[PDB]
Amino acid sequence: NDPGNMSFVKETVDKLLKGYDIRLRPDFGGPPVCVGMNIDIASIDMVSEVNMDYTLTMYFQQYWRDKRLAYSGIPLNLTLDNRVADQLWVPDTYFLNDKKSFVHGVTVKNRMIRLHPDGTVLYGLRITTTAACMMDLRRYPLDEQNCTLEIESYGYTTDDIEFYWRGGDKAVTGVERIELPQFSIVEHRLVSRNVVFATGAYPRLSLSFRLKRNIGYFILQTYMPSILITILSWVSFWINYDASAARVALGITTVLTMTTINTHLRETLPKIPYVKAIDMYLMGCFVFVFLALLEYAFVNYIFFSQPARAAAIDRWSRIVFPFTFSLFNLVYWLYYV
Amino acid sequence: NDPGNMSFVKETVDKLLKGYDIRLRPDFGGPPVCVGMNIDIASIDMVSEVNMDYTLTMYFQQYWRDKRLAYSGIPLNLTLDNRVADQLWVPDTYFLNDKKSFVHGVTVKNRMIRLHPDGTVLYGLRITTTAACMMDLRRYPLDEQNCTLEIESYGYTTDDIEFYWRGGDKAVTGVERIELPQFSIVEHRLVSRNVVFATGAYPRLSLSFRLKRNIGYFILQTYMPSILITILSWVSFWINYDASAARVALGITTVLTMTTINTHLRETLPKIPYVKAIDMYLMGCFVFVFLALLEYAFVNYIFFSQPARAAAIDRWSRIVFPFTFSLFNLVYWLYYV
Amino acid sequence: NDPGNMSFVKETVDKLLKGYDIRLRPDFGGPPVCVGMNIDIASIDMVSEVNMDYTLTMYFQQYWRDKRLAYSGIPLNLTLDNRVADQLWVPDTYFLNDKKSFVHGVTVKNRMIRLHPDGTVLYGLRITTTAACMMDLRRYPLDEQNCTLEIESYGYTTDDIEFYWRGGDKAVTGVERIELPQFSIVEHRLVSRNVVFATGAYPRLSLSFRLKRNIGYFILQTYMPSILITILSWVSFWINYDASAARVALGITTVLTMTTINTHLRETLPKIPYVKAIDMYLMGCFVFVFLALLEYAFVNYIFFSQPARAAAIDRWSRIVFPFTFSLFNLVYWLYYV
Amino acid sequence: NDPGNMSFVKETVDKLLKGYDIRLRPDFGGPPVCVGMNIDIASIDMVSEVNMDYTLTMYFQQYWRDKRLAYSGIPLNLTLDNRVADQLWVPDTYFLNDKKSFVHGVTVKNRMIRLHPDGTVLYGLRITTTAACMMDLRRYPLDEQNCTLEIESYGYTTDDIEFYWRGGDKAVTGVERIELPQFSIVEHRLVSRNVVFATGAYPRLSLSFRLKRNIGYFILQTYMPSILITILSWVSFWINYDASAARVALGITTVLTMTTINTHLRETLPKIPYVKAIDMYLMGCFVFVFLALLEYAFVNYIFFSQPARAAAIDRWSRIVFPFTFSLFNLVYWLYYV
Amino acid sequence: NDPGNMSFVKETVDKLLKGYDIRLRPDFGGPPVCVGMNIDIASIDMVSEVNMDYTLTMYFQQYWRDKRLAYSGIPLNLTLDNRVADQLWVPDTYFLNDKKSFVHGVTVKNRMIRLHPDGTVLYGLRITTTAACMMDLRRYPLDEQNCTLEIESYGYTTDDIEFYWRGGDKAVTGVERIELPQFSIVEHRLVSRNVVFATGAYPRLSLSFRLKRNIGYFILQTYMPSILITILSWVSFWINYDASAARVALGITTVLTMTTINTHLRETLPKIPYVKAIDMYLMGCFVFVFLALLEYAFVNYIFFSQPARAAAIDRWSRIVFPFTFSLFNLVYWLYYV
């Protein structure tokens, strides 16, 4: 009789689950059951360009109405043990573009079932997915990626189930509390639509994040070493022309260090058949240091015929090389920013 | 009687599963049950030559008839819960060449069961399979590979089960929309045959992709550094031979850099017993960058006898080495393309 | 009645579980059930800065009261086989910041169930969890980090369940015995509070450690080589200005070694965008060595026309560079202390 | 009664499974149950020297008799659904030297149960197992390994179970089609015996392969480059003793290239304490090139005071070094071949 | 009534398991049930310092007495199917210092249940456990480590369970059959005791191994290359000092090659906050080669003012450097042996 009577609530639940067919969706053979979805993103763990995928952790909650679960006489929202979820109908909601996802199970399966007097069911899961995000790296590291999560019903068509973002544009929360060390979340968008496969029309909810890659790490790691090596190569121009060994050592060391600057990129990137921006900058710097070495080679080659022309070429280079490199940096940074 | 009446539909389903035996195939003791199949390829995640295998995610659908699951009076197709598959007969379809595969299970098992009024079952799964693919790397990285997927009945024979592609060559979809950064899909084929083993004849469906590898990554990662190091080695010919330290440093550094490139390349690949094209090109570049040092030694040797021939050798080498390298590259690229 | 009468104990347990409903929490529809918690930390396996997480193995014990499990006639505590835990109600306690956690299952599932005559339940598990600890590296490697373990009830609000540290500050034991290879644990705090989400107010526990990173390793790895390179670059001041080759070689070696040391440090950390303290020190050392090299270049550029000026500049650099570098080191080590 | 009457077949199967005790082996307490085994090796995925194990995918079929499963009236072999294997007694066959083994489960568990009218059970699995193969690498890469797969009953002794190879020497098939890029299967053997442990005598089966390593990779990666480097080191003997730069450059380049060749293979093998054949050959070649360089050093040292002696040493080296290397090759390739 | 009568044995077993409560330990409320143990070590798969743990495979067998499992009239030891282990009480044995342990499950769970007439139960499992082992790597790679395996009862105190090594000091077998490529098992010990935790005393068994590392691999891969590079610097010493390029190249190449010695070995080593012996030896060798280079540089610097002093420096260097290196090797090898 009283809500504090445990046997009465047990009888209510047993009467709810008596004759319950988990094989049928609510309102079977009639209007489709509408499911509302919310996502509370705990964190985006990693964004791997090598595998071209991002790892996400979220509280994914679905909200629908099963009239078979409506109870009368209890003025409370019955939060039931998660195991009861094995005895109810739940949507066959899956993530279209995932590769490895699971529901956490410590200390129990991270899953929540809550029933409402009007029959409404709230079903929540803590899910860690690894969704595939195809990235265009033509502007790496100054690129801007768009990674999406696609949510769909696997077996039920639009005649049987319908999806919507419960709460409108505020359905997905926690985006502003995401710390990606190498990325920043420019924007996120929610999309709802229907897609027509050969088996019929299926609902679809899309959650898209536009990430922008930072630049500080690459400045500290790649661009500054290349600029400093190029300037060190320039330093040879003020050296006296007679120092053959010194200038050749300068050229060789600069070229080899320029080659070894970014060996750490063959492991952090996939195999792509195009030039990135970092490859363009490295190629330009290598071309400049190699041209400095060739300039000294020409100076040595024509030194004997004209002792003054070698000095003239050195004096011209002292100014021509820095100005040309500055122009190259200007066009490069205006193009990619 | 109306489909809106959920109790009537539940009665019909219970009648369908009343006395149903999951251990007996449809038409047990009779004609083999035809099981059509279709595949929708979501993506080809990776293709690896170190392991000689490719990962493939797909919607795999089986279409057959089980007259024990024939219901009358309902003009609808019953999309049942994914957990009803444990209470039906499903073909023991397996992938003959796979190594490790699984069915995605978030939020629930990615599985679809649909029944039809004439007792016809559609059974769909979402499967990520890592299938082996032996590769002929004799023409790597300009190689063209052929990777297959062999679908077979495990226990039942051709006297109990038959396989065919549902819809002919249109039975496999999504092939043209596969994003492979390194490869490109030239052609895909479908074959249906029977294979004889000691236990009898088994049905067999073969799906085949011909993959053409792209060259840009290796052009910008292996060939270009080798050409640059070869030119750097050539640089020593314009250095006057009295500058001993310069030429010694150039030769030693170029030889060591070529060795490093070769070591990286051979540590990025498995241990095949034949010769790869990239190995041939690296060996040719190594031969050239060692002939440069041996030419310096030749100059230092014939310099004892006559000094004019010492300079004549350098003058001739400045023309010979670029021309010989150009001819070598010409014949190499004309053969392997 | 007899303690040795195992049949009587079985009858008592069957009476306890007769009509028991695992779907209903103790005192359902009434006051929240106070679940006290204890943790015995066996070990912290590893603290990873690259993945920003730490692995923790612990004995996690929950302690609550269920009147349905109260028994009489047995003046003893019933330590039951852990497989009875599947038939009782247990809190849906989870860890908010974990990424991959499991319960050890050899030889049996590492689990303990103990029942007390008054109805008290003790429920112990052995858990290994990879908790995500976001780290700020602006002072690395002289940084003091704060890594937390958050404990929450997934589906029950504060109306249903309440968490507390059973024993106060002594609830978590074994912290002093943790042997971290790199860090040293300074302090740990236990915080009991409540949090608010759109679904209501949830209880929260927090076990926080403050870790002070040991400095000796990075002192002997990332600082001594830099200081040695700086002093070796200083040695170039005592070299006479006639020997251009030796001073050029010293400058080249010092600058390129500083760059290689920067890369060596970079090969050990994630791709954070901000500047670390060690990065600042490496930049300072590079500035000093580059200044020394440019000073030599200046002397060489004007030594012939102004030899006394060159000698005076060399002496003043000899006396200035150690002083300025020592001042820089003192101010740097004062800034980060 | 008819084979097409599925109800009669279901009745027969249910009658067979009525009263069946999965806890008792067939003919419990009487003569041991005879289990015959066949293996159809699909492929050998990899043979790893570092891990000392090999991966093996096979169709493993067991064949025994159980009178409790004998049926009459149906003159057909009943190929039952795989799940029925969970309701029958099956031998506790396990592989003694495996590390990680599993039965494939897509789209169903790759399991086959076939019953025969006399009670004969045929039980087939598709197992992928990584079995440890401790290798002897004292003759690597000219080694010849012997890798075995051991099959044993875990619980039942020879008083309760016996093993035999069903088919004699034709029990294992598919060996002739194994495609190992690096190894070739010289021979395979079948062994049957009993092994005595403290708990009694257990049946044992052994499937042995003798793998012979292909030498083409090591010929094209180790031996040929080493021979070429040794010859190019000999080349310096024809250079004049005064040409210190060229001869010392030749020596240094040859020695460092030999070091690189040694360094190459060390990353794909375990840390075995003994000496491999490649280690011996590379040690010999390194000694040869080092002796060439040291001979030039001695010639340079004694040239100023004893020029004719230096010329004699060069001339004698021109003969001794090729002769000694020929002798070393002869003895090395007689000992290891 | 015969031992070959299967239905009689089934009646006996059903009588045994009728009225059997798996939730109660044997002698509940009475004296603790002694549980003897044995281990048959199959192998030690790997030992890792990166994770500081070892993978150990064993047959772990438990021996206890359950009066409720006593059968009469059958003079046989009933070896039951492993599935019956799910219907029996088994000790809550767990390995205290493991990280990821599992039980092999092909072709069945590697599990043995054997019942004796007097109620005795033998329960055997095959377990692959990754046990944690903290290592003192100060004397690496000449260290002797001690790795343990701690076996303990989880939920039962010393008043409910007692452990003892069944057989005495011969309770663990197969130790001498363990083949570790890099380690040799000098000794193993068995310890039995009680540990007093907050909830009273708990039984504890400990199996300890001592492993002495094999020094041969590091001799063949680390020490010999460094010694050879030092001898190469000594070779550089003997060259006539007027050959600038030769000695410069030899010194620089030796320095760089010495810097690039244990790069492969550092990868598979931790970030331990102390210096290993290999690091000290490599630092000493680098110091020696750098000192050789500096000696030559000083000789070249002062070789035009006092050639008589430069010749003396070289004569004394040729004696001091080998003697100093030999003394360093003597003291190093005496300190760590």
Ligand SMILES: *[C@@H]1O[C@H](CO)[C@@H](O[C@@H]2O[C@H](CO)[C@@H](O[C@@H]3O[C@H](CO[C@H]4O[C@H](CO)[C@@H](O)[C@H](O)[C@@H]4O)[C@@H](O)[C@H](O[C@H]4O[C@H](CO)[C@@H](O)[C@H](O)[C@@H]4O)[C@@H]3O)[C@H](O)[C@H]2NC(C)=O)[C@H](O)[C@H]1NC(C)=O
């Ligand atoms: C990463 O990249 C993806 C694309 O690859 C972006 O996704 C797109 O986002 C835009 C919104 O920014 C989507 O545009 C909207 O699509 C809705 C659904 O379209 C379907 O249904 C309608 C009928 O309802 C069909 O006409 C249509 O063909 C589709 O089948 C529309 O309902 C939206 O319409 C809105 O605007 C129009 C005016 O433009 C109004 O008239 C409408 O009333 C309504 O307000 C709109 O067109 C687009 O569909 C998305 N693409 C895909 C493939 O889904 C991500 O946004 C991007 N990431 C980020 C962070 O931006």
Ligand SMILES: *[C@@H]1O[C@H](CO)[C@@H](O[C@@H]2O[C@H](CO)[C@@H](O[C@@H]3O[C@H](CO[C@H]4O[C@H](CO)[C@@H](O)[C@H](O)[C@@H]4O)[C@@H](O)[C@H](O[C@H]4O[C@H](CO)[C@@H](O)[C@H](O)[C@@H]4O)[C@@H]3O)[C@H](O)[C@H]2NC(C)=O)[C@H](O)[C@H]1NC(C)=O
């Ligand atoms: C990657 O490599 C694989 C092989 O390793 C290729 O697979 C082969 O594909 C070809 C088609 O391109 C297959 O050839 C076809 O086989 C069919 C089946 O043959 C079975 O049945 C017949 C009887 O009907 C038996 O005689 C035979 O032994 C088999 O048991 C045939 O029906 C096809 O016949 C076609 O051609 C003939 C003329 O030659 C016509 O008369 C027919 O009407 C018909 O048009 C055909 O022969 C071949 O069997 C496949 N091999 C395997 C092992 O599967 C992949 O194609 C390749 N990848 C790519 C992208 O090409």
Ligand SMILES: *[C@@H]1O[C@H](CO)[C@@H](O[C@@H]2O[C@H](CO)[C@@H](O[C@@H]3O[C@H](CO[C@H]4O[C@H](CO)[C@@H](O)[C@H](O)[C@@H]4O)[C@@H](O)[C@H](O[C@H]4O[C@H](CO)[C@@H](O)[C@H](O)[C@@H]4O)[C@@H]3O)[C@H](O)[C@H]2NC(C)=O)[C@H](O)[C@H]1NC(C)=O
């Ligand atoms: C690592 O970083 C974390 C934060 O990310 C630190 O955790 C914080 O720890 C402090 C304590 O050091 C916490 O502050 C404490 O909060 C308690 C709870 O207050 C909440 O709940 C009550 C109701 O129960 C509300 O009334 C209140 O508004 C809050 O919503 C308080 O009870 C504590 O009070 C105690 O201290 C104050 C003085 O500070 C006294 O006046 C009180 O009498 C009492 O003794 C206290 O305020 C803080 O909430 C924690 N943060 C989070 C996010 O949980 C870790 O400490 C840090 N690691 C280390 C090693 O320091």
Ligand SMILES: *[C@@H]1O[C@H](CO)[C@@H](O[C@@H]2O[C@H](CO)[C@@H](O[C@@H]3O[C@H](CO[C@H]4O[C@H](CO)[C@@H](O)[C@H](O)[C@@H]4O)[C@@H](O)[C@H](O[C@H]4O[C@H](CO)[C@@H](O)[C@H](O)[C@@H]4O)[C@@H]3O)[C@H](O)[C@H]2NC(C)=O)[C@H](O)[C@H]1NC(C)=O
């Ligand atoms: C890789 O290396 C393993 C060893 O590490 C090899 O395995 C051995 O193979 C040989 C055969 O080449 C085996 O020898 C044979 O054993 C059979 C079983 O005998 C059992 O029973 C007797 C008692 O009846 C016991 O004494 C014995 O220990 C066994 O328990 C015998 O039946 C065989 O008999 C043959 O020789 C005798 C004479 O000696 C003749 O009278 C017979 O007619 C017959 O010709 C034989 O003795 C040996 O047991 C295997 N050992 C193991 C541990 O497996 C692999 O062969 C090798 N791999 C390859 C590819 O060669």
Ligand SMILES: *[C@@H]1O[C@H](CO)[C@@H](O[C@@H]2O[C@H](CO)[C@@H](O[C@@H]3O[C@H](CO[C@H]4O[C@H](CO)[C@@H](O)[C@H](O)[C@@H]4O)[C@@H](O)[C@H](O[C@H]4O[C@H](CO)[C@@H](O)[C@H](O)[C@@H]4O)[C@@H]3O)[C@H](O)[C@H]2NC(C)=O)[C@H](O)[C@H]1NC(C)=O
């Ligand atoms: C790797 O390192 C571990 C330690 O980290 C070593 O393990 C230790 O091994 C030694 C033996 O070499 C153990 O010493 C023995 O401890 C036993 C247990 O003592 C407890 O229990 C008894 C009652 O049973 C109490 O009285 C006692 O106070 C303790 O509470 C003792 O029973 C043993 O006694 C032996 O010697 C005495 C004389 O001194 C005799 O009278 C006894 O009969 C008996 O022979 C002994 O003292 C030590 O306990 C182990 N450590 C731990 C933590 O348990 C490993 O051995 C090492 N690896 C290798 C290969 O050596």
Ligand SMILES: *[C@@H]1O[C@H](CO)[C@@H](O)[C@H](O)[C@H]1NC(C)=O
């Ligand atoms: C609780 O409900 C049951 C079932 O209706 C009833 O028998 C019992 O008396 C109730 N208890 C109280 C205290 O009202």
Ligand SMILES: *[C@@H]1O[C@H](CO)[C@@H](O)[C@H](O)[C@H]1NC(C)=O
């Ligand atoms: C729905 O079908 C059931 C089962 O046949 C029947 O008992 C019930 O009366 C039907 N409902 C209506 C409204 O006819």
Ligand SMILES: *[C@@H]1O[C@H](CO)[C@@H](O)[C@H](O)[C@H]1NC(C)=O
């Ligand atoms: C089929 O078998 C069932 C069960 O034995 C029997 O009742 C029925 O009459 C049979 N029908 C035919 C056509 O044989």
Ligand SMILES: *[C@@H]1O[C@H](CO)[C@@H](O)[C@H](O)[C@H]1NC(C)=O
């Ligand atoms: C085996 O024992 C059962 C039970 O006592 C009995 O019914 C049966 O007849 C016995 N078997 C034989 C062959 O006597």
